[PDB]
Write a protein that binds this DNA or RNA. Structure first.
Ligand SMILES: [Mg+2]
Ligand SMILES: [Mg+2]
Ligand SMILES: [Mg+2]
Ligand SMILES: [Mg+2]
Ligand SMILES: [Mg+2]
Ligand SMILES: [Mg+2]
Ligand SMILES: [Mg+2]
Ligand SMILES: [Mg+2]
Ligand SMILES: [Mg+2]
Ligand SMILES: [Mg+2]
Ligand SMILES: [Mg+2]
Ligand SMILES: [Mg+2]
Ligand SMILES: [Mg+2]
Ligand SMILES: [Mg+2]
Ligand SMILES: [Mg+2]
Ligand SMILES: [Mg+2]
Ligand SMILES: [Mg+2]
Ligand SMILES: [Mg+2]
Ligand SMILES: [Mg+2]
Ligand SMILES: [Mg+2]
Ligand SMILES: [Mg+2]
Ligand SMILES: [Mg+2]
Ligand SMILES: [Mg+2]
Ligand SMILES: [Mg+2]
Ligand SMILES: [Mg+2]
Ligand SMILES: [Mg+2]
Ligand SMILES: [Mg+2]
Ligand SMILES: [Mg+2]
Ligand SMILES: [Mg+2]
Ligand SMILES: [Mg+2]
Ligand SMILES: [Mg+2]
Ligand SMILES: [Mg+2]
Ligand SMILES: [Mg+2]
Ligand SMILES: [Mg+2]
Ligand SMILES: [Mg+2]
Ligand SMILES: [Mg+2]
Ligand SMILES: [Mg+2]
Ligand SMILES: [Mg+2]
Ligand SMILES: [Mg+2]
Ligand SMILES: [Mg+2]
Ligand SMILES: [Mg+2]
Ligand SMILES: [Mg+2]
Ligand SMILES: [Mg+2]
Ligand SMILES: [Mg+2]
Ligand SMILES: [Mg+2]
Ligand SMILES: [Mg+2]
Ligand SMILES: [Mg+2]
Ligand SMILES: [Mg+2]
Ligand SMILES: [Mg+2]
Ligand SMILES: [Mg+2]
Ligand SMILES: [Mg+2]
Ligand SMILES: [Mg+2]
Ligand SMILES: [Mg+2]
Ligand SMILES: [Mg+2]
Ligand SMILES: [Mg+2]
Ligand SMILES: [Mg+2]
Ligand SMILES: [Mg+2]
Ligand SMILES: [Mg+2]
Ligand SMILES: [Mg+2]
Ligand SMILES: [Mg+2]
Ligand SMILES: [Mg+2]
Ligand SMILES: [Mg+2]
Ligand SMILES: [Mg+2]
Ligand SMILES: [Mg+2]
Ligand SMILES: [Mg+2]
Ligand SMILES: [Mg+2]
Ligand SMILES: [Mg+2]
Ligand SMILES: [Mg+2]
Ligand SMILES: [Mg+2]
Ligand SMILES: [Mg+2]
Ligand SMILES: [Mg+2]
Ligand SMILES: [Mg+2]
Ligand SMILES: [Mg+2]
Ligand SMILES: [Mg+2]
Ligand SMILES: [Mg+2]
Ligand SMILES: [Mg+2]
Ligand SMILES: [Mg+2]
Ligand SMILES: [Mg+2]
Ligand SMILES: [Mg+2]
Ligand SMILES: [Mg+2]
Ligand SMILES: [Mg+2]
Ligand SMILES: [Mg+2]
Ligand SMILES: [Mg+2]
Ligand SMILES: [Mg+2]
Ligand SMILES: [Mg+2]
Ligand SMILES: [Mg+2]
Ligand SMILES: [Mg+2]
Ligand SMILES: [Mg+2]
Ligand SMILES: [Mg+2]
Ligand SMILES: [Mg+2]
Ligand SMILES: [Mg+2]
Ligand SMILES: [Mg+2]
Ligand SMILES: [Mg+2]
Ligand SMILES: [Mg+2]
Ligand SMILES: [Mg+2]
Ligand SMILES: [Mg+2]
Ligand SMILES: [Mg+2]
Ligand SMILES: [Mg+2]
Ligand SMILES: [Mg+2]
Ligand SMILES: [Mg+2]
Ligand SMILES: [Mg+2]
Ligand SMILES: [Mg+2]
Ligand SMILES: [Mg+2]
Ligand SMILES: [Mg+2]
Ligand SMILES: [Mg+2]
Ligand SMILES: [Mg+2]
Ligand SMILES: [Mg+2]
Ligand SMILES: [Mg+2]
Ligand SMILES: [Mg+2]
Ligand SMILES: [Mg+2]
Ligand SMILES: [Mg+2]
Ligand SMILES: [Mg+2]
Ligand SMILES: [Mg+2]
Ligand SMILES: [Mg+2]
Ligand SMILES: [Mg+2]
Ligand SMILES: [Mg+2]
Ligand SMILES: [Mg+2]
Ligand SMILES: [Mg+2]
Ligand SMILES: [Mg+2]
Ligand SMILES: [Mg+2]
Ligand SMILES: [Mg+2]
Ligand SMILES: [Mg+2]
Ligand SMILES: [Mg+2]
Ligand SMILES: [Mg+2]
Ligand SMILES: [Mg+2]
Ligand SMILES: [Mg+2]
Ligand SMILES: [Mg+2]
Ligand SMILES: [Mg+2]
Ligand SMILES: [Mg+2]
Ligand SMILES: [Mg+2]
Ligand SMILES: [Mg+2]
Ligand SMILES: [Mg+2]
Ligand SMILES: [Mg+2]
Ligand SMILES: [Mg+2]
Length: 272
RNA sequence: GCGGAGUGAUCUACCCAUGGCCAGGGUGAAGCGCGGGUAAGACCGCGUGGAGGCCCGAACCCACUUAGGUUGAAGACUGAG
RNA sequence: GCCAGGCCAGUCCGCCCAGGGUGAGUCGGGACCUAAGGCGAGGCCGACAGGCGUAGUCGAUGGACAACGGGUUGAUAUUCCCGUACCCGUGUGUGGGCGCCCGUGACGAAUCAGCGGUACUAACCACCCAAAACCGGAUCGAUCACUCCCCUUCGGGGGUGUGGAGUUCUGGGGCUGCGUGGGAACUUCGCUGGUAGUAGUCAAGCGAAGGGGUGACGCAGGAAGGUAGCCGUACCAGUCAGUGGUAACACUGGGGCAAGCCGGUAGGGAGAGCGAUAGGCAAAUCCGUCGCUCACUAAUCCUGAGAGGUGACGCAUAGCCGGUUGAGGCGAAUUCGGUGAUCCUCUGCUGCCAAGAAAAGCCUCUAGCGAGCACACACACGGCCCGUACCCCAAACCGACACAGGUGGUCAGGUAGAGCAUACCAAGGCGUACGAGAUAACUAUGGUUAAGGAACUCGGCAAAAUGCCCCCGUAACUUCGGGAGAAGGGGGACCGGAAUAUCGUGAACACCCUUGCGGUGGGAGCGGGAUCCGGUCGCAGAAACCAGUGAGGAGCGACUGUUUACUAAAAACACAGGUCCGUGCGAAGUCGCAAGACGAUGUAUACGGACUGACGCCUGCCCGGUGCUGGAAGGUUAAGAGG
RNA sequence: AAAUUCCUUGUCGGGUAAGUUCCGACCUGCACGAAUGGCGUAACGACUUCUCAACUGUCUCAACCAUAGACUCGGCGAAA
RNA sequence: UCUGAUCGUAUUGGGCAUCUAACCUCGAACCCUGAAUCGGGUUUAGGGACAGUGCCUGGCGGGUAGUUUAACUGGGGCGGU
RNA sequence: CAGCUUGUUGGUGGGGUGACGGCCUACCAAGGCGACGACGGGUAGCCGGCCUGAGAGGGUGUCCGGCCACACUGGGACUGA
RNA sequence: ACUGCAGGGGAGACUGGAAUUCCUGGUGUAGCGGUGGAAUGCGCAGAUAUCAGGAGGAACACCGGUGGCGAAGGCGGGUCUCUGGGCAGUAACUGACGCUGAGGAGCGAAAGCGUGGGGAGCGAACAGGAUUAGAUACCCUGGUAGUCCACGCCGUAAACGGUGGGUACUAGGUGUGGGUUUCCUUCCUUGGGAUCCGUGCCGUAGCUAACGCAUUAAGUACCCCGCCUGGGGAGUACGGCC
RNA sequence: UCGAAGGUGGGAUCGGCGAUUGGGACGAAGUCGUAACAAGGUAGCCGUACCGGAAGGUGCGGCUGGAUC
């Protein structure tokens, strides 16, 4: 699962890395790859809108099939499990019996060579994609969509899962990875099972260089700035900031969710 | 110093795309084998292997100390480290 | 040319004057392609100004694409000329081949009659229920009438037995139906004869829209096989350098040549047919997927550095003659080894995680077009636009200067050396622009120093010292990796012998066979390193240049890194790790009036903010204040309503 | 008794011939204290600080040599 | 009958519920469209008189802006006046 | 005190001894010792004997006798049976 | 070896009910909780109580015992999969292949440690109330780690039968468990008798200072291992291993 | 060549002193509490964790070397 480096250097002393034991076919599928380029956290104006971005290893995008709507009743065979630099889960390449190749998020327990079904008549097995109406309550699902046909949007990171609490009339109550209970329409599609690569959260990056490779740039604390730069700046020695904690633009801590967002009627219980 | 409207990222700060460069030595990680060990092991020793914000050190990038310069060769440099 | 300029002078000049000089189908670009990014028809947004952006169109620092050697001018040359190549296009002939119609072959339906799928289902058969209505059983309680019985103010209970419209369970045909299962004819579909081998389709060639494949990609590390270059050498042509020796292999010089074409080596890679087909915006014989057979260690095919041939009867060259010292003319030998890449095979191979452009181009499929086509040879032609002079670690560029500064890429020889360090040299350049003198102090840059050895000083600042290779040996502590080159020691030159395979590198003459760019033995010639023993010299053998000082105790920051261009490099910043808070998704946050964008082609193991800052042990008490989160009983409180 | 301690060269011990610095304690903390983290910590440092070996013109205490200037002659010829 | 408690036609506003048709959707499909992740239109699936916006109005608001922050004084500050 | 040894273990050919022998030397093998305690630390002359104890045993090595080791400390050769 | 027998022996996976708590809604108003007595605390902004639905973790009443199993520690909600051991019977097979075991190795309650998850209830630490001269406690109200899961670490308990393992022998009486066996075999009795393996109690001899042991010995003998030489200091110091 | 003595160096082992500091034993007729021996007033012990002037207290698991129906 996780391989620990040996303390041969100070940079490697405590670090660890995935063993990549689940990976076959170390190259991607040429027909499902699109170009990508970095932004450095800059928007269309050319200005930094997200801080601490840039550098980073070059990447290529792999088209993930997040809809899974048009292959109902058509079986697929899992051909490979591949590394993806754009997400924390691994991806599985599917060979459809119709001759088409697709990429999906690899669920937990979807070894190469398995058969994957879709539609209302599919069996309840990891990797099978069904509308929520046909999934029994208490199941663990992932890659759920908010609107019918809108594409999977929830529970997509490594190790994520959603528990189908129940379907009442035309809505399904879901326990979402944050712990918030939500309702979505029963016609929304979901995939059975939990997302794989669940142990990646235990990886110990060893040095600053590794995060620079992953594209994360250094972050400077507010209390070591000058007051013209940050509200926490100033002071003779080191201070705690001369006030209650605030953002670099002076906003205090507290809830930032819009108080009367339209979706409030779909949320049963806020997270802890 | 204040206001209005414009000009500047050929210097410099960061970022994006596409290219180039890093003499010569040293150390010897994982993994892979063989043998020892056992019921199996764990482990151990020999090889192979060639990792690393690894070591010494030119090009290259810097600028710690000191001497000189200080109407300078130079509006920030030279010599030795 | 010499009155300005050149840090002096100048007959000289990067200065002044006149004239001359830059030749491309292949070099670098355009006419080809796209990245980041720019502009942007319509468009969306915005009082106006304008912002953003789709189709599209630009934009190399990248992709694709055809040339090498020699000569020549005062000044250009892969451009001109000579020799020899390659790429794209056009015309003219010649030859055979396939096609239009003819027919050639092949493939190739449709009509209508015989039965079932009993699929349709009027009905019919079975399975449960309303099991309808109704006959009618047991129980219930305070209604009800009946007859038997009893107190009472004359109004009703009770033993309730019967049943009434009575509650519930249920005894019985469940006729009518519901739901399901079998299920009547034509009707949906199939077979046999039949329309009929008929209609009809395909069979030269081109397909550039569109589909598909390729193009197409990271970093690190070698190894093997090669080659360039370099060092010798067979052979060739010469020299006598006025010194003691040296007359020929003693010494000096030579000991060359490309693209292209042929070739298919070492090394690499590849299963082949047939059938089906929901997918690839239409189609597809293409791609993808699936099934079957055969094949698998082979064979075949592709790729492929090198070797060899040709290019080359040519060019070049050491040298020799004559030479206004310009041009001329002649012109030898050219073999075999060693060493050896930063280059080639190799867009390969191995390993790793941080997971590594696009489009054109090329190939292929069909849509489509199509009566003429495709090919071979020969001849004759067309190949456009811009750059090309000269400087280019500089006196010609950026620094006001002919300024000790700065400036990307390519080539890069010998001896010693690990080396692109360092010392001296080659090829090739240069002596660079004020000089000539003179033992003043003093300043600067170097050098040496008796005895002492940090006594100097804020402080060992500066200088001195250590320094290489090989062999021994190596502490506390430790996160077990380190500390460590710890510390501290020993040896090092030359000559000879071992020593003729001593050893190790490659492998000539000469040894077999599937005869080749083949295999084995073989050991010549040529290079390399180490050790032991004996001897020799010096003050000194790492010889010059070059080239770690080491140890012990504390503080701070874990570490590599970053920082005040021009007085501060640190204990400051960052960091991996930690906790808290926010964010349920065109999220929170940020830019923007807005549209829109980034976040992210991400989805709570994610993203943003704050503080702390490897690791180890831990992180105590306080919610009074102020923030944040949540609640709404009460008080207070705006516009509006009311008037 | 600290990058925090004014008094202050606090007191005791070590080191030195002689130690306001250094190291180990004491606790009388002017004015330490647990993520503006507390206490340690192998490795690392052109960081700050103390000691030792070796070495030396840093010094006792200076002396000599060469070069570039300074000095003389010819030419050009500024500046505050 | 200050009629507290109260009924039925008017009228009205406040809550709650439902609906769809205004309005909303970066849900989907098709056309403009030959090349289109823009835009617009058509249909559909949802939300829905909410939200958003205009005008009026209360709160909060070092996020930004313009400013103020006296004099005397055996120098100024401290104190005092 | 849990790992000790490299002339150390053995063999070969010489040298050396009065005499066998790594005793010494040149070459070859990788062996030899160790939990029945090597290697290391502390202590000590051994025995016949002496004392005590019914005995087994416990203590001790002085008179005397036997031997060993030493001659200021450390090292070496010669004469000689 | 073959045939039967009993079992909470162990591991994994799925799953069930009761109860507590919490959430939502209905009914509903002024108390609830707590003690020897109270107060802190909770509710009045709608609590306790009652109903219905949902969420979640822990533990499995009745069976259940004096019982069974396991080397010890320990072991029962149910089902399935995998697996260990024991007992009985035949004597089918080998033929002393046995016992103990220095060191060594493995297993090993609870508490605790590392990493991730989980957390209903309880509950060190901590806080408030109460008692008391004081109350850093006993009592009450709360409440963190922990108790739970996964993989590791730790190897300590009054880890006790305060009794090392193996074998042979030494009256009986009375319960229970698993077998087998003829007979009384219907005396239905699943009783009695015989044997083997256990598990309790009482009791003969013997042993013991006594208490007591007594076929499950602390009796009579043998073999092997471990341990003690008065009490503190001390199972502590130093050294060493983990 | 070997070879006593001597010098240089890093280590190994055994002791002595040491500012300061921890625990132990004994002393007197001190101060602060009553933890155990009774159900010792909250039963006592065993292993661990945490806390507090101190004896000790609390939690987890085990024993009776106590009692109860
Ligand atoms: Mg812009
Ligand atoms: Mg950030
Ligand atoms: Mg930071
Ligand atoms: Mg600052
Ligand atoms: Mg700024
Ligand atoms: Mg501010
Ligand atoms: Mg500050
Ligand atoms: Mg401060
Ligand atoms: Mg803070
Ligand atoms: Mg501040
Ligand atoms: Mg201005
Ligand atoms: Mg501009
Ligand atoms: Mg290197
Ligand atoms: Mg290895
Ligand atoms: Mg490095
Ligand atoms: Mg810098
Ligand atoms: Mg200076
Ligand atoms: Mg000067
Ligand atoms: Mg300098
Ligand atoms: Mg320098
Ligand atoms: Mg002139
Ligand atoms: Mg002049
Ligand atoms: Mg634009
Ligand atoms: Mg326009
Ligand atoms: Mg563009
Ligand atoms: Mg262009
Ligand atoms: Mg280019
Ligand atoms: Mg020229
Ligand atoms: Mg030509
Ligand atoms: Mg690609
Ligand atoms: Mg090679
Ligand atoms: Mg001569
Ligand atoms: Mg020669
Ligand atoms: Mg195919
Ligand atoms: Mg050739
Ligand atoms: Mg030119
Ligand atoms: Mg030129
Ligand atoms: Mg140029
Ligand atoms: Mg210039
Ligand atoms: Mg210059
Ligand atoms: Mg440069
Ligand atoms: Mg060279
Ligand atoms: Mg050089
Ligand atoms: Mg020279
Ligand atoms: Mg001169
Ligand atoms: Mg003079
Ligand atoms: Mg001297
Ligand atoms: Mg001297
Ligand atoms: Mg000194
Ligand atoms: Mg001094
Ligand atoms: Mg002095
Ligand atoms: Mg110095
Ligand atoms: Mg020096
Ligand atoms: Mg050394
Ligand atoms: Mg050290
Ligand atoms: Mg000599
Ligand atoms: Mg060095
Ligand atoms: Mg300290
Ligand atoms: Mg640092
Ligand atoms: Mg620290
Ligand atoms: Mg500076
Ligand atoms: Mg500086
Ligand atoms: Mg620095
Ligand atoms: Mg900084
Ligand atoms: Mg937003
Ligand atoms: Mg969070
Ligand atoms: Mg905070
Ligand atoms: Mg900090
Ligand atoms: Mg951080
Ligand atoms: Mg507070
Ligand atoms: Mg507060
Ligand atoms: Mg409060
Ligand atoms: Mg509030
Ligand atoms: Mg102090
Ligand atoms: Mg202080
Ligand atoms: Mg002091
Ligand atoms: Mg000093
Ligand atoms: Mg001190
Ligand atoms: Mg705190
Ligand atoms: Mg502080
Ligand atoms: Mg704090
Ligand atoms: Mg800190
Ligand atoms: Mg500290
Ligand atoms: Mg550094
Ligand atoms: Mg530093
Ligand atoms: Mg100090
Ligand atoms: Mg003069
Ligand atoms: Mg509205
Ligand atoms: Mg404000
Ligand atoms: Mg202001
Ligand atoms: Mg003003
Ligand atoms: Mg005043
Ligand atoms: Mg005054
Ligand atoms: Mg020998
Ligand atoms: Mg011998
Ligand atoms: Mg003695
Ligand atoms: Mg006796
Ligand atoms: Mg002696
Ligand atoms: Mg004497
Ligand atoms: Mg002697
Ligand atoms: Mg004699
Ligand atoms: Mg003799
Ligand atoms: Mg488990
Ligand atoms: Mg809860
Ligand atoms: Mg309620
Ligand atoms: Mg309730
Ligand atoms: Mg037999
Ligand atoms: Mg045993
Ligand atoms: Mg044992
Ligand atoms: Mg436990
Ligand atoms: Mg734990
Ligand atoms: Mg945890
Ligand atoms: Mg309290
Ligand atoms: Mg309690
Ligand atoms: Mg509680
Ligand atoms: Mg803890
Ligand atoms: Mg264990
Ligand atoms: Mg027990
Ligand atoms: Mg015994
Ligand atoms: Mg026994
Ligand atoms: Mg026994
Ligand atoms: Mg019995
Ligand atoms: Mg008894
Ligand atoms: Mg006894
Ligand atoms: Mg102990
Ligand atoms: Mg110890
Ligand atoms: Mg003392
Ligand atoms: Mg007591
Ligand atoms: Mg007690
Ligand atoms: Mg009491
Ligand atoms: Mg008690
Ligand atoms: Mg307590
Ligand atoms: Mg306890
Ligand atoms: Mg207990």
């Amino acid at each position: 699962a996780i391989r620990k480096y040996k303390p041969t250097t100070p940079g490697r002393r405590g670090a660890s890395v995935s063993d990549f034991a689940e990976i076959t076919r170390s190259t991607p599928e040429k027909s499902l790859v699109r170009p990508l380029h970095g932004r450095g956290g800059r928007n269309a104006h050319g200005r930094i809108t997200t801080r601490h971005k840039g550098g980073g290893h070059k990447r290529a995008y792999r088209m993930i099939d997040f809809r899974r709507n048009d292959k109902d009743g058509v079986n697929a065979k899992v051909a490979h499990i591949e590394y993806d630099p754009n997400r924390t889960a691994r991806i599985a390449l599917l060979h459809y019996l119709d001759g088409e190749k697709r990429y999906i998020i690899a669920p937990n327990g979807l070894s190469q060579g398995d058969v994957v079904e879709s539609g209302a008549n599919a069996d309840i097995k990891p990797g099978n994609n069904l509308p929520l109406r046909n999934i029994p309550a208490g199941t663990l699902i992932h890659a759920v969509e908010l609107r019918p046909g809108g594409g999977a949007k929830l529970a997509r990171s490594a190790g994520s899962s959603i528990q189908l609490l129940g379907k009442e009339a035309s809505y399904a109550s879901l326990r979402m990875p944050s712990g918030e209970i939500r309702r979505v329409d029963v016609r929304c599609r979901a995939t059975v099972g939990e997302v794989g690569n669940a142990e990646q959260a235990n990886i110990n990056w060893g040095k600053a260089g590794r995060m620079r490779w992953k594209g994360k740039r250094p972050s400077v604390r507010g209390v070591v700035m000058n007051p013209v730069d940050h509200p926490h700046g100033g002071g003779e020695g080191k201070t705690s900031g001369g006030r209650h904690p605030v953002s670099p633009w002076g906003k205090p801590e507290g809830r930032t969710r819009n108080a009367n967002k339209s979706s409030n009627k779909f949320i049963v219980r806020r997270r802890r």
